[model samples]
Target: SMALKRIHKELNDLARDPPAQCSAGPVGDDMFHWQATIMGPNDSPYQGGVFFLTIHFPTDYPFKPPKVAFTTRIYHPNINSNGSICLDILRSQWSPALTISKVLLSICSLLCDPNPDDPLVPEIARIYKTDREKYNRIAREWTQKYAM
Candidate 1:
């Protein structure tokens, strides 16, 4: 009941004062399952694109981190082809103090500044490190094709 109550408050807060560049809410009656979207950051290769993602909160939410995955394909070293993200806050670094709004903001930040050194896809990371232009080009192409 606590988790549901927290989720309700979070939903209300988000609806009342939505975060910039990101939006999320329950995917119907399932408060524990949500669909989210994040607009690409300006000046980045992903700019102008809109990325969709899924979030599944656990029964003991706030105590345990939710499972988030990108439903839309994105070209990033920190995100695998299957949409699994390699973000610290989503994993071992998660805390009860963190909210969905904060998580979305962090994901938006990652879109702007990916952590190539700690990547989910090694080849993408290598390209990001060795050939930034090429990486940008590919990322842009992916954004155009998949995120538009």
Candidate 2:
């Protein structure tokens, strides 16, 4: 009858080895607001960087997607300057069956492969479209500047 029950299970799982690339948990005893870190895989321009994110789980818990935004600066087409990311799964495509590890992997998906069809705003997307080399350069540059 409580989200904490669900959260505790996830927390217990986080204690084990799943994927070292991403790790997450509560910030305090509060349990609802959490902080997470995603390590950029070597395959991505986001590689070797540590991107932090803030998560908020509502009272409704499982059915309602956790509110998430990158707290660390990252340069990516799907992610905006404001830290909001354009993730379909985080919205309409969400399912309670999805857990934190999977969600972080999905977040990594966007980092490794930017979707041309979806961009947080046209500005970053356009750069990735025509001048991908520059896009790659800046993504790594920002990774070093802010995230590394």
Candidate 3:
């Protein structure tokens, strides 16, 4: 029941001291499955929008990383229309030491600064590199259109 206990601790921490602009918890009676909400950052184009992501904790808990993907549509180079994030920490760079709040903070940071060099959406990356104002325009538009 080690995994179960760890999950419970995470839930309590998340509940008692939630991250800024982000919150997550169990859903549908499954402790392993959760839904998280991220209120868009004021310093980014996604401001005034809301983004949602689904997370599934591994059975091994701390030893393995959780699965996370955006359910809310967003326009970003590091994130795709499919809601897949290009951050390596979710994959190759995962560490048992990291917390869900840290992950959420990273995603929030991503919204403010995209990794254009390593992009999941090539078209968005191209626009971001070539015309910054245009990239911001489209991202802001989509944020209002879909994530509003």
Index of the highest-TM-score prediction: 1
TM-score order of candidates, top first: 1, 3, 2
Against the reference, the lDDT scores of all candidates come to 0.94, 0.86, 0.91
Model 2 earns a TM-score of 0.94
lDDT of 2: 0.86
Clashes of each: 0, 0, 0
Put down candidate 3 lDDT per residue, 105-126, tens digits, no spaces.
9999989999999999999999
TM-score of each: 0.98, 0.94, 0.96
* Candidate 3 accuracy as lDDT: 0.91
Q: How many backbone clashes does candidate 2 have?
A: 0
Compared with the true structure, the alpha-carbon lDDT of candidate 1 equals: 0.94
Instruction: Kindly list the per-residue Cα lDDT of model 2 for residues 1-148, writing each as its tens digit.
Output: 5788888888888878566678899987988888999999787888889999998888877888889999898878788878898898789999999888788989888888899678786877899999999999998999999997
* Pairs of colliding residues, candidate 2: none
Query: Can you give the lDDT of residue 51 in candidate 3?
Result: 95
Say which candidate scores most in lDDT: 1
- lDDT: worst 10-residue window of model 3: 1-10
